[PDB]
Design a protein around this ligand. Structure first.
Ligand SMILES: Cc1cc2nc3c(=O)[nH]c(=O)nc-3n(C[C@H](O)[C@H](O)[C@H](O)COP(=O)(O)OP(=O)(O)OC[C@H]3O[C@@H](n4cnc5c(N)ncnc54)[C@H](O)[C@@H]3O)c2cc1C
Ligand SMILES: Cc1cc2nc3c(=O)[nH]c(=O)nc-3n(C[C@H](O)[C@H](O)[C@H](O)COP(=O)(O)OP(=O)(O)OC[C@H]3O[C@@H](n4cnc5c(N)ncnc54)[C@H](O)[C@@H]3O)c2cc1C
Ligand SMILES: C/C=C(\C)[C@H](O)[C@H](C)/C=C(C)/C=C/C/C(C)=C/Cc1nc(OC)cc(O)c1C
Ligand SMILES: C/C=C(\C)[C@H](O)[C@H](C)/C=C(C)/C=C/C/C(C)=C/Cc1nc(OC)cc(O)c1C
Ligand SMILES: [Cl-]
Ligand SMILES: [Cl-]
Ligand SMILES: [Cl-]
Ligand SMILES: [Cl-]
Lengths: 579, 213, 580, 75
């Protein structure tokens, strides 16, 4: 007999696991989380939160706690290429939708902005919100060893690392959120497709007042090249607390000895990157780690589902890792809640893989390409191996000359700079992904498309699978997004004038399935107003039509007009994958 | 301003508001705006069309910022005035076409951020140029002989002058690197030249601008 | 068989605290409702103001507690209950108030996570509205006047006016919430006449700004009760602190004679300056209101599928400040019960328990407040004030109070005994927090109710006896501090247990299957759950470690069991609770 | 800029019945609307702001008086 019985076991307490713990909390699903380490992350790691993470954080009711601590969007307004921090600059683009040409789209696209909050601050927030909710249990210092599963459940073996005692956990479902080199994913016999240790990195967390060098060009990422270095020896400064707290990343060649603990050598390397020897640098941590680029071909097996780093790893370019993990967990949890209530088949749980596995392929591919893009900048300048500091200063100096060589270098830099949008303004990747198969019913219409780069540019649509478009509504004198009045662990049917047939079809949906569908009319029936007419423009259905929104804010189904009301019951049974 | 004043009455008219109506009738016409009739449909169209016209006062960016001097203290360069499909009252189009307000771009001088508008004006004529624009130097000196008026030559992106960190000024200036945009003390463009070729024209150009004998 | 303009599970008539609290409950449980309010705006003048510990707690469950504590007067600046002459003149007697006095403060802190604070109705009401329009689950129509209803086995039909357009429409509800205030239209409709009395006295409230900090800061109080010398006992002035010490209410009680003029902003201005006793004090009137003190309670709160809350069902003088508080609790008793009937999880027997539970509480508060009004005159009567005394004769009765005579010793005696009775309204801890439901949505465990020899109106006594408000203890869930009252409520049943209480897992599983309702099992100081750092919970829970306390969504105990032996009874207990 | 209302607080142009009553129509204003904010930011180093004539006139006086080059005679 097992030592513990619990509906869901979450293995790992990083962003993925804690998000799942939170979502299950809000849904009232009792669960247990085990984390190997006795504490949350002690160093910053991931830090950029994108608009989609914002929306999920609103749905989970911690957005305000997050916003209180985070760097706001405007202080990440550029992406900088430079020599040293104190030396001349090479190129600059707007970043994160701050440039004039992107800001309108970024504002229209989401109630949420982008912000910067490092893991060591974000994890405690998620912990606190879980503890407050008091629905599930966090066990830090408990390491998952192994699992066996059957038709009825999952049996897991756990080690208390203080006592040394083993114990067993019987659960209906198990969430593998145990990071890169997942013990859970290995236990399932799923191997990652991709590559391991494609490069090495040394991330120093440090304090130093570099505001003299950064305030006038606020950025998340300052990317430098010390004259006299090969192009691959880039130095990356990441702003953590403008302008006194930073990360510094170097990429040592395979033929090199990394001494994490040689704080002296690390500090002199940081002084060299800064290009000012009078700057006081306080080292807070130094970490070596291996860049991977891999994705699991299967996210799930039976009653075990893996999320986050367990199933996708990639270089930090684009900052898609943490965001994707959050969205991975947010895709899964509502599905578990329905299964445990007997209101959904295992067919619904299969849709976690279906919907999120393509998204992992996409982010890994995008991150990779963006990494490769970085080297194009020093290459464009003419930088190579076996060059003195003097030759490289001369190349920077002569970039602005009135010669053919200079003109081509300027043109090549332009083109190389332009590719960096695919990491700094990749709005289509961040917000614009659409599930093409899964817990959703096609309406027959073709997926919208246009001639613009679908990685860079987001196109709002209610096409089943897409994230529900944001529009500002007014409910009395309260302003709220379309996304605020949907989600929250429930299915919502958005309707308008002439949509009275949807009331009885939703009532019938619920008799046939057991799943309440909230009918919420917009600019009719006394519902929220559409003050600017945005929702009318974006809903892509007639006034009498409907958009059905999942608890995760993705569109499950849409219908042009009320003539489709009678199909709702059947649509809900297909989405719920019920017999 | 006149047209925008006329537009305002359109809003109540759309709603069907008229004279001799009681509070209770008008509260009804607001209530019965969302009805599915030929009446309310025509009203609702008229409201959204009357609403649309208000942009002419709330977002009249082209009138506010986009006016250009077609005759005055300037010399046309023989190019046609830029124009597009868009309504020229609502939509601004940056141009260095002489007579226009000099386009804004963020430059950087050391670690000091400034607009093209900040490094020009201030009581002087300023000539903006770039790589290969050395000839403008002599032409400016010659111009100050011929005319008595000093022309500060400011190379952007060359010769250690202010930088154009985003490339924006190179997009907006509508001349070649070696060309020149001559900016009046009021921030409007007196003259422009595609390339350094035209450098010898400057003394003459400054004479016509000042209407000197 | 006409055609109703609107089908909606619950209609709530009247948008005051009672009304809005109900909407906010129903909002948080996710129940589609409609509320209609006869006035276009929320209340514009202060009126009610004292929030007691239980309102505190309810606010935390509904999750507007912070939003309410932000605007509110903290409980330390309500430290006293002051009897005086004028506000600048001498003081008569004083006691600690709202558990700020040394001999009560222990009991007040131990009793609740929440404290007492001050927030006037005109500030509160908005916050309730805000919360409701953020939740977006039901709908608030201001400027809509309830007219009439009919009901049957299957629902209620309600005729409404839109007061702007003049048009009438009709609502069809399953259930209807009569929250329409004093003189309840809804309770008329039902044929239920209040027991008691209307217009027992008349009063004049003057909401006014004036810097009296010189007179109030050094003895902080909600309630300053003066007698201007040369006045009869009943001519008590009463100052209430709203924004210390610049904003205020002033209350007089005009005799049956007296022609009262709301509008006369100069006569009222002169009365105030007299009451203060300092003619140089700037006094900016903001509102003056006549109103009639009532003293009545409905003998029935519900009839069929129609349920009344707040003033609609209990009216009393503002002594003890129970009206607002009780109205909040009324709404909170009821909502969770509607939800479980709406989802066919509970019979109409569960909705009968709203009356059974909250009606005895209406009797209690109305009585308590009346008695507390009657006491107030005991102070000026002890001083030996009467009708037909000069200013100069009263000043002397104050002056010679502190004298070595036989007159003075006995007047100081009677003053102390009258002063002692004001505890009834100033520290009424058992009335505020200690009310228990003896019959309703609960199973008695067979134990006799706890008693003691302490006055049960003044002294709260924590117990998990079914019907009692769950006792507060400080828990710790990891490094998060929370009350027993935080880890319970929130729209669901909670079972609190401890070491040896694993059997409750299966009992809770079986109860959910049989009844459809989910019981969440929370072990304390066992199984890696929330801890009991001081062991307080082990003291108060009055069951063994292996036992259980079943908490309702409202934070009252439904049932308890001494030990895990009783695990088998839980399915049937939840059946009986839900009136299945 | 010190004394003036910043642009983001003039975000809309509102058509209403009464100020506490229902609203009738709303558009973004002064380039605060997503579809105009890009052109407005790109077009000028300066934004729109709100400063009434009774506050602006003295600032102009002040700076004239400080420059001390010409002479203001009021009355
Ligand atoms: C310098 C750097 C910058 C980055 N920048 C960004 C960014 O800006 N934005 C962004 O979105 N992403 C970024 N990423 C990626 C980000 O760090 C990860 O993608 C993110 O941590 C994913 O979370 P996870 O919870 O899946 O995994 P993890 O953070 O690895 O957490 C998994 C947890 O499971 C635990 N665990 C492992 N094995 C066991 C076991 N047997 N039992 C119990 N527990 C176990 C671990 O202890 C760990 O706490 C960055 C990464 C780095 C290194
Ligand atoms: C001066 C004063 C001081 C007080 N002191 C305190 C104190 O310190 N502490 C305390 O706890 N209590 C106090 N009380 C009691 C408290 O003010 C009331 O009991 C409380 O306001 C009751 O709220 P309610 O929801 O029952 O109804 P109400 O407050 O009467 O609100 C009902 C609302 O509905 C509207 N309405 C009325 N009729 C209709 C209709 N037919 N249809 C639709 N809408 C309608 C009204 O505009 C009103 O806003 C005091 C009362 C007064 C007057
Ligand atoms: C110039 C040449 C270089 C830098 C190397 O040789 C090779 C080509 C690049 C590598 C190994 C890329 C590593 C990833 C990187 C530097 C990402 C920038 C980043 N982007 C984020 O997006 C939010 C969040 C982040 O914390 C970080 C640090
Ligand atoms: C001295 C004699 C007087 C004042 C009268 O003749 C009679 C006896 C009293 C009457 C008719 C009514 C008294 C009601 C009152 C003043 C209650 C005090 C109060 N107590 C609260 O409890 C927190 C909150 C409050 O807002 C208020 C105002
Ligand atoms: Cl939030
Ligand atoms: Cl990442
Ligand atoms: Cl709260
Ligand atoms: Cl009261």
């Amino acid at each position: 007999a097992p030592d513990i019985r619990v509906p869901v076991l979450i293995v790992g307490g990083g962003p993925a696991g804690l998000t799942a713990a939170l979502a299950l909390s809000r849904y009232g699903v009792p669960h247990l989380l085990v984390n190997r380490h006795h504490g949350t992350a002690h160093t910053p790691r991931a830090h950029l939160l994108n608009q989609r993470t914002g929306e999920i954080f609103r749905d989970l009711g911690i957005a305000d706690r997050v916003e209180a601590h985070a760097t706001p969007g405007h202080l990440m307004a550029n992406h900088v290429f430079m020599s040293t921090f104190a030396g001349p600059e090479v190129a600059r683009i707007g970043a994160y939708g701050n440039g004039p040409d992107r800001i309108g789209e970024y504002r229209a696209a989401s109630p949420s902005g982008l912000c910067n909050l490092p893991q060591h601050l974000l994890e405690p927030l998620l912990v606190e919100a879980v503890q407050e909710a008091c629905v599930g249990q966090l066990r830090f210092g408990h390491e998952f060893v192994s699992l066996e599963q059957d038709e009825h459940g999952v049996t897991s073996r756990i080690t208390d690392r203080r006592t040394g005692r083993d114990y067993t956990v019987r659960s209906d479902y198990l969430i593998g959120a145990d990071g890169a080199r997942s013990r859970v994913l290995a236990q399932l016999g799923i191997a990652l497709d991709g590559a391991t240790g494609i490069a090495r990195a040394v991330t120093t967390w440090f304090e130093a007042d570099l505001s003299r060098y950064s305030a006038h060009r606020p950025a998340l990422l300052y990317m430098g090249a010390v004259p006299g270095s090969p192009p691959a020896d880039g130095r990356v400064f990441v702003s953590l607390r403008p302008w006194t707290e930073w990360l510094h990343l170097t990429f040592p060649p395979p033929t090199a000895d990394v001494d994490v603990e040689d704080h002296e050598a690390v500090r002199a390397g940081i002084r060299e990157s800064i290009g000012d020897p009078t700057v006081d640098v306080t080292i807070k941590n130094v970490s070596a780690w291996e860049v991977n680029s891999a994705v699991a071909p299967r996210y799930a097996s039976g009653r075990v589902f893996c999320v986050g780093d367990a199933v996708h790893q990639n270089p930090p370019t684009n900052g898609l890792g943490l965001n994707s993990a959050v969205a991975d967990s947010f895709n899964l949890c509502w599905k578990l809640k329905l299964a445990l209530e007997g209101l959904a088949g295992p067919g619904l749980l299969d849709t976690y893989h279906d919907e999120r596995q393509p998204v992992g392929r996409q982010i890994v591919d995008r991150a990779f390409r963006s990494m490769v893009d970085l080297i194009g900048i020093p290459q464009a300048l003419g930088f190579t191996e076996g060059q003195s500091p003097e030759e490289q200063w001369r190349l920077l100096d002569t970039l602005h000359e009135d010669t053919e060589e200079a003109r081509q270098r300027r043109a090549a830099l332009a083109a190389a700079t332009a590719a960096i949008h695919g990491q700094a303004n990749a709005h289509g990747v961040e917000l614009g992904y659409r599930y093409r198969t899964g817990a959703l019913v096609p309406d027959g219409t073709p997926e919208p498309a246009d001639e613009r780069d679908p990685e860079l540019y987001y196109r709002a649509t209610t096409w089943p699978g897409a994230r529900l478009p944001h529009a500002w509504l007014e409910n009395g004198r309260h302003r709220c997004s379309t996304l605020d009045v949907t989600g929250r662990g429930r299915f919502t049917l958005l309707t308008g004038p002439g949509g009275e047939p949807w009331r009885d079809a939703a009532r019938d949906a619920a008799l046939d399935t057991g799943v309440e569908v909230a009918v919420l009319p917009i600019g009719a029936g006394g519902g929220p107003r559409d003050p600017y007419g945005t929702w009318a423009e974006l809903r892509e259905v007639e006034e009498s039509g409907a958009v059905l929104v999942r608890p995760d804010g993705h569109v499950a189904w849409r219908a042009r007009d009320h003539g489709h009301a009678k199909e709702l019951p059947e649509v809900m049974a297909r989405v719920l994958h019920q017999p | 301003a006149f047209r925008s004043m006329v537009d305002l009455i359109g809003i109540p008219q759309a709603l069907g508001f008229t004279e001799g109506q009681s509070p209770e009738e008008q509260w009804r016409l607001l209530d019965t705006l969302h009805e599915d009739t030929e009446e309310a449909r025509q009203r609702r169209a008229a409201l959204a069309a009357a609403t649309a016209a208000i942009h002419g006062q709330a977002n009249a960016h082209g009138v506010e910022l986009g006016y250009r001097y077609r005759t005055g203290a300037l010399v046309p360069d023989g190019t046609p005035e830029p124009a597009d499909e868009r309504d020229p009252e609502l939509y601004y189009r940056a141009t260095t076409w002489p007579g226009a307000r000099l386009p804004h771009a963020w430059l950087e001088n050391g670690r000091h951020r400034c607009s093209t508008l900040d490094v020009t004006g201030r009581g002087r004529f300023t000539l903006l140029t770039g790589p290969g624009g050395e000839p403008w130097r002599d032409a400016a000196r010659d111009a100050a002989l011929d005319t008595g008026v000093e022309v500060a030559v400011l190379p952007i992106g060359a010769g250690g002058g202010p930088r154009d960190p985003y490339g924006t000024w190179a997009e907006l200036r509508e001349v070649e690197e070696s060309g020149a945009v001559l900016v009046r003390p009021d921030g409007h463009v007196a003259w422009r030249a595609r390339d350094h070729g035209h450098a010898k024209e400057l003394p003459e150009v400054m004479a016509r601008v000042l209407h000197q004998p």
